[PDB]
């Protein structure tokens, strides 16, 4: 019953303070939230994905507390600082809790190159993280994910010691972190790369859970070795996210994502020799076959035949634009029949009336 | 143009979006004047694929 809402929503707002790249970033984060809801991975209110707009100004964008992922729009998100204070009040009139942002802020304090941080709480990811041994390279998606790090999570990152203990365990160059008994976190320089890593890790974790449950132990898995595996240009996740934005736009969703490679739709046509070429490059009129010309008296007006030897005009047109022009519009029908009776019964009564006489005869009398 | 996307189950977004796109975009667009251009055997295989 039309649950869809426009993701862009920048048209309706007409308010607040935004940077030049703020529109694209807000559309990207809201489209990510919609895609997380629409895959069915996450459904309730939390702070899953966080973004960095400016590298030298912080001002991270987070989701307000109490909004489902289907109801996320671009204007409703909240821009904050590194510490977590609300520097920009969101459009949504909801109470603001910025507690879960703190872990993302610690990861932001660790790496300068990270811009997108995605957290997952799906059942398969949590089952993998709760498992004692690490994620096994038993799937092609897990091989494509790459390296990873494991960190024990106590559920709170308010303490300074926990923040300074995360930094060395995360590593200088690492893309995938696993919070034990809590899920997975993916770090991306771009939003699309982080989304790609999230999707591949997500598929790989149900693959590993299903294979591990059905097989029994590790021996039957015959796991592979990661070491033996080892326009302009695309950057890891451009094509997939572009296709997703294209199809979402075809749903009627308004996404602010612009396309590096736009799409051309042409039916085209096959020429057939049997087909013949296209080969292209009220008023009633009364005609008069002659034309009369006015000639001065040789005063009395005179009109002239002007025959065809003198190159006269051929056809004179007379145009009638309406019917019944010959008859006046306003007329009583009884009058004509009355006058017919008046004229006729003088025959019946046989008058002695004579015609009119000219006045030249009257003068001499 | 109000495509009227179908409602989805909590685990069934893929199915609902797929049938909405099936309602919007037909899979056999060759019908009409364009059906002559392709071969009779080839067009049927394209539709099946």
């Amino acid at each position: 019953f039309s649950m869809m809402t426009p993701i862009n929503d920048l048209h309706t707002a007409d308010s607040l303070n935004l940077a030049k790249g703020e529109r694209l970033m807000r559309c990207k984060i809201s489209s990510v939230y919609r895609l997380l809801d629409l895959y069915g991975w996450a459904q309730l209110s939390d702070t899953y994905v966080t973004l960095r707009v400016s590298k030298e100004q912080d001002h991270f964008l987070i989701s307000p507390k109490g909004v489902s992922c289907s109801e996320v729009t671009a204007s409703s998100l909240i821009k904050v600082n590194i510490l977590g204070e609300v520097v920009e009040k969101g459009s949504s009139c909801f109470p603001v809790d910025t507690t879960g942002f703190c872990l993302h802020s610690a990861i932001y304090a660790a790496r300068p190159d990270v811009r997108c941080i995605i957290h997952l709480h799906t059942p398969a990811t949590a089952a993998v993280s709760a498992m004692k041994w690490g994620l096994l390279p038993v799937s092609h998606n897990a091989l494509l994910v790459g390296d990873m790090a494991y960190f024990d999570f106590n559920g709170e990152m308010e303490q300074e010691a926990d923040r300074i203990n995360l930094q060395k365990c995360l590593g200088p160059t690492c893309k995938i972190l696993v919070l034990r008994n809590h899920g997975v976190v993916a770090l991306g320089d771009t939003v699309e790369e982080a989304f790609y890593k999230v999707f591949h890790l997500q598929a790989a974790c149900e693959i590993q859970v299903s294979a591990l449950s059905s097989a029994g132990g590790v021996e039957n898995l015959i796991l592979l070795e990661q070491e033996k595996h080892r326009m302009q240009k695309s950057r890891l996740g451009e094509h997939e996210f572009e296709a997703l934005m294209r199809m979402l736009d075809n749903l009627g969703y308004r996404t602010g994502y612009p396309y590096r490679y736009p799409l051309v739709q042409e039916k085209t046509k096959h020429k057939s020799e049997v087909e013949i070429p296209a080969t292209v490059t009220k008023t009633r009129w009364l005609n008069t076959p002659n034309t009369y010309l006015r000639v001065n008296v040789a005063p009395k007006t005179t009109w002239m035949k002007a025959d065809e030897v003198e190159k006269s005009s051929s056809g004179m047109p007379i145009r009638i634009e309406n019917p019944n022009q010959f008859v006046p519009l306003y007329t009583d029908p009884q009058e004509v029949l009355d006058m017919r009776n008046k004229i006729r019964e003088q025959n019946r009564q046989d008058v002695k009336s004579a015609g009119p006489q000219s006045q030249l005869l009257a003068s001499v009398i | 143009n109000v495509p009227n996307v179908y409602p989805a189950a909590p685990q069934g977004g893929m199915a609902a979006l797929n049938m909405s796109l099936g309602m919007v975009t037909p899979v056999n667009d060759l019908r009409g004047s364009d059906s002559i251009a392709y071969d009779k055997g080839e067009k049927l295989l394209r539709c099946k694929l």
């Binding site: 049997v274 | 071969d39 009779k40």
Partner: peptide, 18 residues
């Protein structure tokens, strides 16, 4: 191509009429 396309088309008027 055109000849055997009308071949087929007349085939489906036979199929379709009765």
């Amino acid at each position: 191509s055109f000849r055997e396309e009308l071949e087929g088309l007349i085939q489906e008027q036979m199929k379709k009429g009765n």
